[PDB]
Amino acid sequence: KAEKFYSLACYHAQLFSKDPNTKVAALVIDNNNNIASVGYNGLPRGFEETSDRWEKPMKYNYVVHAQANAIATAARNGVRLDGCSIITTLFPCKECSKLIIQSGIRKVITSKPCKDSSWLESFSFSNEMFDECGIEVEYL
Amino acid sequence: KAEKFYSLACYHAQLFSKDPNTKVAALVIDNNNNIASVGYNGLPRGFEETSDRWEKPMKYNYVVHAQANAIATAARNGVRLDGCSIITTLFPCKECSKLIIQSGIRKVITSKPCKDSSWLESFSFSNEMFDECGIEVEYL
Amino acid sequence: KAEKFYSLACYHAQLFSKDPNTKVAALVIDNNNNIASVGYNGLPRGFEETSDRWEKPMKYNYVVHAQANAIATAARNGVRLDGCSIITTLFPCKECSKLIIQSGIRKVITSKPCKDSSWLESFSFSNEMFDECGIEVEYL
Amino acid sequence: KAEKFYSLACYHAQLFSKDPNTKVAALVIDNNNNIASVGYNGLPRGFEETSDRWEKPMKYNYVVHAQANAIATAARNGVRLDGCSIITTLFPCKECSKLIIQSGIRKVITSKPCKDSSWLESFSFSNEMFDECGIEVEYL
Amino acid sequence: KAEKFYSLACYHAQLFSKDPNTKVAALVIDNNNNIASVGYNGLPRGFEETSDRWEKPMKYNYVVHAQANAIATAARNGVRLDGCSIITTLFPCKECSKLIIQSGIRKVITSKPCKDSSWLESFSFSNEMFDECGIEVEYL
Amino acid sequence: KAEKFYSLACYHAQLFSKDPNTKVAALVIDNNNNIASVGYNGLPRGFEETSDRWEKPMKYNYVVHAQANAIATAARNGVRLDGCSIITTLFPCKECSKLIIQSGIRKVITSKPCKDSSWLESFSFSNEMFDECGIEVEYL
Ligand SMILES: Cc1cn([C@H]2C[C@H](O)[C@@H](COP(=O)(O)OP(=O)(O)OP(=O)(O)O)O2)c(=O)[nH]c1=O
Ligand SMILES: Cc1cn([C@H]2C[C@H](O)[C@@H](COP(=O)(O)OP(=O)(O)OP(=O)(O)O)O2)c(=O)[nH]c1=O
Ligand SMILES: Cc1cn([C@H]2C[C@H](O)[C@@H](COP(=O)(O)OP(=O)(O)OP(=O)(O)O)O2)c(=O)[nH]c1=O
Ligand SMILES: Cc1cn([C@H]2C[C@H](O)[C@@H](COP(=O)(O)OP(=O)(O)OP(=O)(O)O)O2)c(=O)[nH]c1=O
Ligand SMILES: Cc1cn([C@H]2C[C@H](O)[C@@H](COP(=O)(O)OP(=O)(O)OP(=O)(O)O)O2)c(=O)[nH]c1=O
Ligand SMILES: Cc1cn([C@H]2C[C@H](O)[C@@H](COP(=O)(O)OP(=O)(O)OP(=O)(O)O)O2)c(=O)[nH]c1=O
Ligand SMILES: Cc1cn([C@H]2C[C@H](O)[C@@H](COP(=O)(O)O)O2)c(=O)[nH]c1=O
Ligand SMILES: Cc1cn([C@H]2C[C@H](O)[C@@H](COP(=O)(O)O)O2)c(=O)[nH]c1=O
Ligand SMILES: Cc1cn([C@H]2C[C@H](O)[C@@H](COP(=O)(O)O)O2)c(=O)[nH]c1=O
Ligand SMILES: Cc1cn([C@H]2C[C@H](O)[C@@H](COP(=O)(O)O)O2)c(=O)[nH]c1=O
Ligand SMILES: Cc1cn([C@H]2C[C@H](O)[C@@H](COP(=O)(O)O)O2)c(=O)[nH]c1=O
Ligand SMILES: Cc1cn([C@H]2C[C@H](O)[C@@H](COP(=O)(O)O)O2)c(=O)[nH]c1=O
Ligand SMILES: [Mg+2]
Ligand SMILES: [Mg+2]
Ligand SMILES: [Mg+2]
Ligand SMILES: [Mg+2]
Ligand SMILES: [Mg+2]
Ligand SMILES: [Mg+2]
Ligand SMILES: [Zn+2]
Ligand SMILES: [Zn+2]
Ligand SMILES: [Zn+2]
Ligand SMILES: [Zn+2]
Ligand SMILES: [Zn+2]
Ligand SMILES: [Zn+2]
């Protein structure tokens, strides 16, 4: 079932993300296997999504990461994430890892990141916080 | 009443924030003047808060901004932030401004930032997004 | 966006439904485009899903329709469906149409059923109730 | 207390059900003895309740069973039924038994059905599913 | 329908209230005619209900009014009473009228009190607050 | 942390209570240290707060105690108080103690009342109910 939700997350990113280079999605799943929240990378709701705003490097001033978006969207909708799992198409960055912990998510399910030395430091900080704060990491 | 909640936010930061240099808090207030969520700057819940982890520059690897924390805490608790106002002791950074929009908060109430040219760019991006996405900014 | 959610519904049915002949799913979507509930056709939760129980005609004694399941699952989870839309891979039967009305769903989005005279009566009753009770039907 | 709620269910059916032959009601009660949801047999909300539509056999095209209605009404209102008990004036049919399981109700309290051979098969299927899926049946 | 709910309230009081002299109940009904909360007069939950504690005048040290109980029970269960109506077997006392206003209830439905000069002052204060604060009073 | 919330309660009363003699506030805090509800002593919402209505003895006809207000406000907002703690600037009166029990609050945190023989009876009844019903009292 974890793999089926991961497959759905991949499809979500392909269908909904407007990023022209890299589409990312995350599903927050509760203990009854209900989809509590969905995030995908994008610009803020209602912000005019011009071609110029989605080019690099300009898009980084406006874009929201998928996992951050899943959490912020749950706050908007008033959906409780404490105890849930997050199934994401990309292992979280350092800042999203903090928000994952703060939202009460207890488990991250994703694929193993490709070896990239520029991300080793960030990856190490995320896993240090996850290990200490009780967040399980499961790689498909 | 906005000023009374801002006063309470200042007291919240002084009482609860462990940052040795700068304490920050934010109250998310609904349309019935109920406190929907509180954030303050800090390390993730349960992360060992050693002296070394709170020193600069190391603390930036672990710290969560107050306004981000208010939103992530609402997602943990399942509290609906759509339509609420956020009363904060510090005008939000560019990334927290994105999360504020995504959480459905409609209004930011704070004090006017001091002139700081290193923050002009960030301040301009936050206000560009707020203006376009319908977030009112009110300075006390 | 309606077509993207319909595509996801089709994928949901293919991934999760255990019916060996016909897989059905339905997504209940709220006015902020959040997935409030998912249903797919299946046997009751925890009921032993033997090969014999999934054969015809025996499976009809135990199977739950996808749209009924979406509504019953929302009641289990305490998710409010009033005002939502249901995007389904199959136009609802007469009994599911009643439950759709009772759950407060205001709109059915699906594909146009193929001409089948054995279902004309049922289809006519569903649309009579939908028309009178204020449920919009939209065909992709 | 179970008998007092059953008495109230009987009164609910007599007061609210428009069926001219048989009035049915069900109360879904949580573990704090709060009434989470009420169902009674009837036509869909807002459907014109003409004399012709309530005659037999025409009414079966439009009527909703009380226990199904209790569950669909909870989905409309966003009331969590997981772990609740359902106190009903009539033992559930095969289809309502499926929905009871799917809604997370853990216990059915009613009176013992009168001997009726035409319902033996249905009664046997309901109890087979209840026994296997963990639903307790208590007869007053 | 208001009269049918009032009839149910009377039955609730007769079935559940342990007061040996006067049994009182109140139903808080939302705009979809769902029973949001029930109160009846009684001693606090789990307090040993001895014969001595239910005698007069001792019982007044421990008893909770039905309408107060309906509101406190909703707070325990987390049920939103804003905009609801309260259907009560007895017109509220001065203190319960305050709590009714504070809970967001917008309408009181009951029977007309019998002429009792010892209650004229209290009745006048309740209606002064109701009139000014926007609470409609409807007598059956 | 209990003392920090008590300090905030004192500030809440000073900022928001309009009583010219004695300002009272109470914070209901959940097990994640989120502020579930706030009460302070005052007149009903929207009632014209004239100088005459706030004088003694007239104000007692209209005023609501802080702890009662915290509970009634939670019912208005639909916030679950079961299992929470109430941190109050004043030990509850006999009637508020009943409502505290009925709302599911499990713990009262306040300062020790000053010796006042006119309140001994009331204080004794509150503590008798708290002891029997499982409410812990903690004095700072
Ligand atoms: C609906 C939805 C949006 N989001 C995020 C993605 C984007 O950053 C932002 C808005 O999504 P968009 O798909 O951009 O939607 P929009 O409301 O901006 O409308 P439009 O199609 O006209 O652009 O919110 C989620 O993370 N989860 C959701 O379920
Ligand atoms: C309780 C609470 C915490 N937070 C944030 C602040 C911190 O970053 C984090 C945890 O707060 P801390 O005060 O650090 O609490 P803790 O659970 O880590 O316990 P301890 O006192 O032993 O350290 O969550 C909020 O933003 N709002 C809240 O209401
Ligand atoms: C999780 C889930 C289940 N259902 C329905 C489908 C089935 O009829 C029933 C249970 O789904 P199943 O996929 O059968 O899951 P299960 O809990 O029975 O476990 P197992 O995999 O061991 O069989 O609930 C939904 O409609 N929506 C949902 O989101
Ligand atoms: C209010 C309510 C309705 N129902 C069901 C019964 C019916 O099938 C349907 C609507 O109930 P009805 O009593 O028919 O109410 P209505 O909204 O159709 O209005 P009218 O009196 O003009 O007919 O919903 C419940 O199961 N539980 C409830 O609490
Ligand atoms: C269940 C319930 C209780 N109450 C009130 C009535 C009483 O004052 C108090 C508890 O109700 P009681 O009927 O006394 O129940 P209890 O939990 O004390 O158990 P026992 O039967 O052993 O005495 O809560 C409501 O107002 N509404 C409700 O829905
Ligand atoms: C907002 C709020 C009010 N209350 C109580 C205090 C008062 O008795 C009542 C209303 O509070 P007031 O501060 O009087 O507010 P109001 O809505 O009457 O507006 P105004 O300032 O014009 O008078 O509700 C709480 O207990 N908690 C809360 O969080
Ligand atoms: C690194 C990272 C990027 N993203 C988003 C930001 C951008 O929209 C996109 C990456 O764009 P890029 O591949 O052109 O650099 O993916 C996430 O959602 N999460 C992450 O962890
Ligand atoms: C800039 C900024 C900092 N903070 C936090 C991060 C740090 O804990 C602290 C600033 O530390 P510093 O003053 O030593 O740089 O304030 C916020 O919460 N929000 C903000 O917008
Ligand atoms: C007709 C219908 C069937 N179904 C389910 C029941 C069965 O599991 C399956 C149909 O099986 P069949 O194609 O072998 O008859 O689809 C629905 O979920 N909704 C419907 O409206
Ligand atoms: C068999 C059954 C019927 N009903 C309803 C449907 C009809 O409105 C009524 C039975 O009508 P009848 O007695 O004329 O056949 O009771 C239920 O609510 N639940 C059941 O389990
Ligand atoms: C006056 C009043 C009494 N009651 C309760 C308190 C007692 O249990 C009972 C009255 O008892 P009595 O008739 O012996 O005086 O009714 C309410 O619930 N609401 C009210 O408004
Ligand atoms: C005794 C008591 C008073 N109060 C309020 C009622 C009045 O507004 C105020 C007391 O006014 P006083 O000090 O002039 O008598 O405090 C509470 O909120 N809780 C209590 O337990
Ligand atoms: Mg957009
Ligand atoms: Mg900490
Ligand atoms: Mg199964
Ligand atoms: Mg009707
Ligand atoms: Mg009792
Ligand atoms: Mg006022
Ligand atoms: Zn990230
Ligand atoms: Zn920030
Ligand atoms: Zn169907
Ligand atoms: Zn049935
Ligand atoms: Zn009263
Ligand atoms: Zn009091």
Short mmCIF file of C-alpha atoms in Angstrom, two decimals, chain D residues 45-129:
data_model
loop_
_atom_site.label_atom_id
_atom_site.label_comp_id
_atom_site.label_asym_id
_atom_site.label_seq_id
_atom_site.Cartn_x
_atom_site.Cartn_y
_atom_site.Cartn_z
CA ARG D 45 -33.77 15.81 1.46
CA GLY D 46 -35.85 18.23 -0.65
CA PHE D 47 -37.42 15.56 -2.87
CA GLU D 48 -41.14 16.29 -3.24
CA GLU D 49 -42.87 13.79 -0.96
CA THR D 50 -46.06 13.17 -2.91
CA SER D 51 -48.64 10.60 -1.88
CA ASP D 52 -47.77 8.63 -5.04
CA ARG D 53 -44.06 8.52 -4.17
CA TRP D 54 -44.80 7.05 -0.71
CA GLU D 55 -47.10 4.27 -2.00
CA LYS D 56 -45.85 0.72 -2.57
CA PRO D 57 -44.01 -0.34 -4.69
CA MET D 58 -43.06 3.12 -5.94
CA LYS D 59 -41.50 4.25 -2.65
CA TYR D 60 -38.66 1.71 -2.90
CA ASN D 61 -37.21 3.66 -5.84
CA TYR D 62 -36.71 6.69 -3.58
CA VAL D 63 -36.57 5.63 0.09
CA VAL D 64 -33.40 5.55 2.22
CA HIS D 65 -33.10 3.12 5.14
CA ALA D 66 -32.77 4.62 8.61
CA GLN D 67 -29.33 3.17 9.32
CA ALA D 68 -27.91 4.18 5.93
CA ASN D 69 -29.38 7.65 6.55
CA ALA D 70 -27.67 7.91 9.95
CA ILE D 71 -24.32 7.23 8.30
CA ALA D 72 -24.86 9.50 5.29
CA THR D 73 -26.09 12.26 7.61
CA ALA D 74 -22.90 11.97 9.67
CA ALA D 75 -20.83 12.35 6.49
CA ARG D 76 -22.83 15.48 5.60
CA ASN D 77 -22.27 16.94 9.08
CA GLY D 78 -18.68 15.72 9.43
CA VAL D 79 -19.38 13.72 12.61
CA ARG D 80 -16.93 10.89 13.38
CA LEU D 81 -18.68 7.52 13.79
CA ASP D 82 -15.57 5.35 14.33
CA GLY D 83 -16.01 3.41 17.58
CA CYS D 84 -19.68 4.36 18.05
CA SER D 85 -22.70 2.13 18.69
CA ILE D 86 -25.88 2.19 16.61
CA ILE D 87 -29.19 1.70 18.43
CA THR D 88 -31.84 0.85 15.85
CA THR D 89 -35.54 -0.01 15.90
CA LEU D 90 -34.93 -2.68 13.23
CA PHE D 91 -32.04 -5.09 12.71
CA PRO D 92 -30.08 -3.90 9.64
CA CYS D 93 -30.48 -5.34 6.18
CA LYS D 94 -27.47 -6.80 4.37
CA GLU D 95 -26.55 -3.54 2.64
CA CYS D 96 -26.86 -1.37 5.75
CA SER D 97 -24.71 -3.91 7.64
CA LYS D 98 -21.92 -3.29 5.12
CA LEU D 99 -22.20 0.48 5.60
CA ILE D 100 -22.24 0.07 9.39
CA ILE D 101 -18.91 -1.78 9.17
CA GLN D 102 -17.46 0.78 6.77
CA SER D 103 -18.47 3.70 9.02
CA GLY D 104 -16.47 2.28 11.94
CA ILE D 105 -19.49 1.51 14.14
CA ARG D 106 -18.51 -1.28 16.54
CA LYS D 107 -21.84 -2.39 18.01
CA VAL D 108 -25.48 -2.84 16.96
CA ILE D 109 -28.18 -2.72 19.65
CA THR D 110 -31.75 -3.60 18.65
CA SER D 111 -34.59 -6.00 19.35
CA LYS D 112 -34.53 -9.60 18.16
CA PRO D 113 -36.18 -9.89 14.70
CA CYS D 114 -39.36 -11.92 14.44
CA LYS D 115 -39.00 -15.25 12.65
CA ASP D 116 -39.30 -14.53 8.91
CA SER D 117 -37.88 -17.13 6.51
CA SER D 118 -37.72 -14.65 3.62
CA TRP D 119 -35.10 -12.70 5.64
CA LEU D 120 -33.06 -15.67 6.92
CA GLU D 121 -30.49 -15.39 4.12
CA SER D 122 -30.01 -11.64 4.57
CA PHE D 123 -29.84 -11.97 8.37
CA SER D 124 -27.22 -14.70 8.00
CA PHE D 125 -25.02 -12.57 5.72
CA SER D 126 -25.23 -9.55 8.06
CA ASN D 127 -24.21 -11.65 11.06
CA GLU D 128 -21.42 -13.39 9.13
CA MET D 129 -19.91 -9.99 8.28
#
